[PDB]
């Protein structure tokens, strides 16, 4: 697990219904929302990849060894029942393991793509911002609507605002 989704992010946003991961902002000219296509698509490719593996199964052909409609000799019938049940225990166990193991990795992978976005933004803002610890960045300069989009763009040039921010931070 990464400390994010059931961790330092307090909860999820029920209102975000274009993305898996997103930004909310608040500058002086309003509050807005936006989803991040890159990281959500990263996580969805990994989901459809699992699902592919799950259905991407080709099968052996089996014939009947048990008569539906007539009596089978007692001893050979007992062997067949032991084998058949024993194979089923193996498959039932295998399916349970498959799903429990793959659900674990899925929950944690989603969490890693959540964190990987947070880290990207953090390294991007550089000395211009500080984090509270609920997943927010307190920015120490005037961030325009076109500046906000710049952070989401990965456009943002930290050097452009650095001095105003460093000044604001230190006092």
């Amino acid at each position: 697990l990464f400390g994010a989704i059931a961790g330092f992010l307090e909860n999820g946003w029920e209102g975000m219904v274009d993305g898996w991961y997103g930004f909310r902002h608040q500058n002086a000219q309003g509050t807005g929302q936006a989803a991040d296509y890159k990281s959500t698509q990263a996580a969805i490719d990994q989901i459809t990849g699992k699902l592919n593996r799950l259905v991407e199964k080709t099968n052996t052909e089996f014939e009947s060894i048990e008569s539906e409609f007539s009596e089978i000799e007692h001893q050979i019938g007992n062997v067949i029942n032991w084998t058949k049940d024993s194979i089923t225990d193996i498959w039932t166990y295998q399916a349970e393991l498959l799903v429990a193991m793959e659900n674990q990795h899925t929950i944690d992978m989603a969490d890693s793509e959540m964190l990987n976005l947070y880290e990207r933004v953090r390294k991007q803002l550089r000395q211009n911002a500080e984090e509270d610890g609920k997943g927010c960045f307190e920015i120490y300069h005037a961030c325009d609507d076109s500046c906000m989009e710049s952070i989401r763009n990965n456009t943002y040039d930290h050097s452009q605002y650095r001095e105003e921010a460093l000044l604001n931070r230190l006092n």
Partner: protein, 318 residues
């Protein structure tokens, strides 16, 4: 001035199981175990044969119920619950092996034995237990041989079937066991009955036995059936005294097919690869809980009602 980061959530979440947690809520999930099956045998694109009330054995000996299924070609063969193998009561040695060989076949052909019988012998024995156009009949590929005159000793008789084909053939005969000394005397005489059957790879002796018995299909005698595979270029000889139910035709199993035992009606406009007693299964899922006895190319049977696979993140509602 703040920029914040977050994930989504939903009101109605889904519960899945993990390695550490049995009750874990996620944004989304789907089944991995199929529970719904088609109540039809999906036979489209298959050259199939629905036997109806003809038992596969009845195909070889030619029971009336099997008159429409004496010869044919198929990649899939369907046996039903009400299937008749015997009209005149009786049994077959190694019946399950033989039934399995028929149900793995891809068709049957028939070939005359060419057997012929002198005037002492009546080939045309019929019984009330095999009915055919309102009239008494008999197994279509066999002949009930008896003494033309009612009390006379059946003559010592020899018949040989020669397999001049390139493939092996499958030959069935019967042995009659009368229910009474009078029934026996009348059919074959008072003499001492015996039947030998020999080929390169088979050898055996049979003796009719009189015993009293309950009636099955109104008949108290029985006919036990025997079979063997006659190789290419090989011959099988019948030496007999009365009691032999003789083959007038032999069989040739051809190719490979998938044998199916089912309740379900046929749907020839539907495609499938997986079958069971209740019908068909068409699914992308790796597992299934409809039937532990399936046939064909099937998902694997698991003892669970459901196994939900997460396709979303942890659901943490607001």
């Amino acid at each position: 001035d703040k920029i914040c980061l977050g994930h989504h959530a939903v009101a109605n979440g889904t519960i899945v199981k993990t390695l550490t947690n049995e009750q874990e809520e996620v944004t989304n999930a789907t089944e991995t175990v199929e529970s719904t099956g088609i109540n039809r045998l999906c036979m489209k694109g298959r050259k199939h044969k629905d036997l109806g009330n003809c038992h596969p054995i009845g195909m070889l000996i030619g029971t009336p119920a099997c008159d429409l299924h004496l010869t044919g070609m198929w990649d899939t063969l369907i046996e039903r619950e009400n299937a008749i193998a015997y009209c005149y009561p009786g049994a077959t040695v190694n019946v399950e092996a033989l039934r399995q060989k028929i149900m793995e076949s891809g068709g049957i052909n028939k070939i005359s034995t060419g057997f012929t019988y002198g005037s002492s012998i009546n080939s045309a024995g019929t019984t009330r237990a095999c009915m055919r156009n309102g009239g008494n009949s008999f197994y279509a590929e066999l002949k009930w041989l008896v003494s033309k005159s009612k009390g006379q000793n059946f003559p010592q008789t020899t018949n040989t079937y020669r397999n001049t084909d390139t493939a092996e053939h499958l030959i069935m005969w019967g042995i009659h066991h009368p229910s009474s000394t009078q029934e026996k005397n009348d059919l074959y005489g008072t003499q001492s009955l015996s039947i030998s059957v020999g080929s390169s790879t088979y050898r055996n002796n049979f003796v009719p036995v009189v015993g009293a018995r309950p009636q099955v299909n109104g008949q108290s005698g029985r006919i036990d059936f025997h079979w063997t595979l006659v190789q290419p270029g090989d011959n099988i000889t019948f030496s007999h005294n009365g009691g032999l139910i003789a083959p007038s035709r032999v069989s040739k199993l051809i190719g490979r097919g998938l044998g199916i035992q089912s309740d379900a009606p046929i749907d020839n406009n539907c495609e499938s690869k997986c079958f069971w007693r209740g019908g068909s299964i068409n699914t992308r899922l790796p597992f299934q809980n409809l039937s532990p006895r399936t046939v064909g190319q099937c998902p694997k049977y698991v003892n669970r009602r459901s196994l939900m696979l997460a396709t979303g993140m942890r659901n943490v509602p607001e």
